[PDB]
């Protein structure tokens, strides 16, 4: 029946949260999304949940479209904003049944959000510098943990960080914008996974095009061409005329994507060009942009300096193979990482782990302003706002206090999703952050995260679990705005 649409809306919020409450966190349980046609899907992230979750109540529609807005804005955090919004709604409904007129609640929530964002922009961590490597390597190892490579995982975590630092490509705005496809996968056989090492350039496994091409070339002009070099029955037969003509222009090292040629031996000896087939298209585009050149199909008649650069192309025995070590291009983009062992089928999970470590490291590198993850931010915000509510002193004390208490539901759900006792863990987090403010000498106790491996309070800046400042700021702002909008809606009776 219902006695107040406030109650009905907060029940809708509680339901829509409880549906997606469990899936938050890397240890979240998957959800079983059945449809009318029976084509069911399985997912563990809230964005994929709410994009196809069948909603019926208008409050639920509002909450889910705020969630979609947050996802389109910053990406991660949909689960967190939905959970925080639902917690705020239910706490504010209890407080309005405590005979508080909702506009005071809205004002208190807005003031609390302003104070929270100002606090976060004041007590964040600026470790995302060149001095920060131990935290970064620790984060890579922790995200890389629970695998058979943990013996040698230290070297992988040490090479990935300075590789992505080196392969970092600046943009037109003078900021680091690492392209993920720049680091290319590479298989290897023979030696096991513990013998892998970092290579500063892409190395394609193919047949030996020629032997007259030296390791280091002072001047290289990549006249990349798709067509093969063969004699058939500006040239009718694409073997000599265009190659020599562009040699006159200055094409020294030509990366011919086409097939091999019978008389190409002398031309490669005198010029220093290579003919490699079966080149992966993404790798070909990357080496095109790494060498600062476009893809040329034919050469019918620009050629002055647009041709790509391959300064050093080592022609030696690498993993008992003659890999074409095309590196030192004009733009520092072409590089690859070896994956040893026997083959790619068993180490495919190792490949995905390396990919995700690369992704998390490069996301940490961007958004130079960063905050500790794992619920430390929420605990610090709760401690701040509990004091700020009493300091402010107007009639929004209860509103700000319940906003502070509602922020500690994220550590609770992370704790319960990690099979650990939720209340005990959040209480430990709260007590640890009490010393951050009460004790002025305990300044460096502000990043006690949640080590989900054991579910124990732990330093997290050293651990390295990081969240972009913009992500948390926008998440909190959107959650507060959604709470204000829902609380501002009561013009029904049911």
């Amino acid at each position: 029946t219902g006695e107040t649409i406030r109650s009905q809306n907060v029940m809708a919020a509680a339901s829509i949260a409880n549906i997606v409450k469990s899936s938050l966190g890397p240890v979240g349980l998957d959800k079983m999304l059945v449809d009318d046609i029976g084509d069911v899907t399985i997912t563990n992230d809230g964005a994929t949940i709410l994009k196809l979750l069948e909603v019926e109540h208008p409050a639920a529609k509002v909450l889910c479209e705020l969630a979609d807005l947050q996802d389109k804005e910053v990406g991660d955090g949909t689960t967190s904003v939905v959970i925080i919004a639902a917690e705020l709604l239910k706490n504010a409904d209890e407080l309005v049944k405590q005979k508080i007129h909702p506009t005071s609640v809205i004002s208190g929530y807005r003031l609390a959000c302003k104070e929270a964002v100002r606090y976060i922009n004041e007590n964040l961590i600026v470790n995302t510098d060149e001095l920060g490597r131990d935290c970064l390597i620790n984060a890579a190892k922790t995200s890389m943990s629970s695998k058979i490579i943990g013996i040698n995982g230290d070297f992988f975590a040490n090479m990935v960080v300075d590789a992505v630092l080196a392969i970092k490509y600046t943009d037109i705005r003078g900021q680091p914008r690492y392209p993920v496809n720049s680091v290319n996968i590479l298989k290897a056989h023979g030696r096991s996974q513990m013998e892998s090492m970092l290579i500063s350039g892409y190395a394609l496994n193919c047949v030996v095009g020629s032997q007259g091409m030296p390791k280091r070339i002072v001047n290289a002009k990549i006249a990349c061409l798709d067509f093969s070099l063969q004699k058939t029955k500006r040239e009718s037969d694409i073997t000599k005329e265009r190659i020599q003509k562009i040699l006159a222009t200055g094409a020294n090292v030509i990366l011919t994507t086409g097939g091999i040629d019978d008389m190409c031996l002398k031309y490669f000896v005198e010029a220093g060009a290579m003919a490699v087939r079966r080149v992966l298209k993404r790798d070909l585009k990357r080496i095109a942009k790494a060498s600062g050149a476009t893809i040329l199909s034919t050469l019918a008649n620009f050629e002055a300096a647009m041709l790509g650069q391959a300064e050093e192309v080592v022609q030696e025995r690498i993993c008992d193979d003659e890999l074409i070590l095309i590196k030192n291009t004009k733009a520092r983009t072409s590089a690859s990482i070896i994956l040893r062992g026997a083959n790619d089928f068993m180490c495919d999970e190792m490949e995905r782990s390396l990919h995700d470590a690369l992704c998390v490291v490069k996301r940490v590198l961007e958004s130079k302003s960063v905050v500790p993850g794992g619920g430390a931010v929420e605990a610090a915000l709760s401690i701040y706002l509990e004091n700020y509510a009493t300091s402010m002193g107007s009639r929004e004390q209860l509103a700000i206090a319940e906003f502070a208490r509602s922020l500690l539901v994220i550590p609770n759900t992370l704790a319960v999703n990690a099979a650990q006792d939720s209340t005990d863990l959040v209480a430990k987090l709260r007590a640890f952050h009490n010393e951050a403010q009460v004790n002025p000498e305990r300044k460096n106790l502000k990043w006690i995260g949640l080590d989900l491996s054991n579910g124990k309070p732990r330093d997290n800046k050293q651990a390295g679990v990081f969240e972009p400042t913009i992500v948390k700021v926008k998440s909190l702002k959107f959650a507060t705005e959604a709470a204000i909008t829902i609380l501002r809606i009561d013009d029904l009776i049911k």
Binding site: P58, V62, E65, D68, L69, K72, A482, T485
Partner: protein, 104 residues
Amino acid sequence: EDIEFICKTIGTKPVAHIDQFTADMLGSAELAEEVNLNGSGKLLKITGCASPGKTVTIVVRGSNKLVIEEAERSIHDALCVIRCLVKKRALIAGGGAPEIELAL
């Protein structure tokens, strides 16, 4: 029903037959582009016109259809207040003061 409004705004004369159809028979605009907002709705943005005579448009957004209607009602309330300022030139203090004053 929106044909008359569109013709009034962007200055397009109506075209019923292909016999007298020309470019100047229509109304040109500076830019006409479609954008995606949050990936859940496509709104065309024909931004700028040669002669946008007495017309503005605001993409009124909000949590739901109904609060969007609320924003529209607020905008039209402001427009009507401005119109009342135009028609009648007499101003009073508000915020409940006139009501209590006149009650006394």
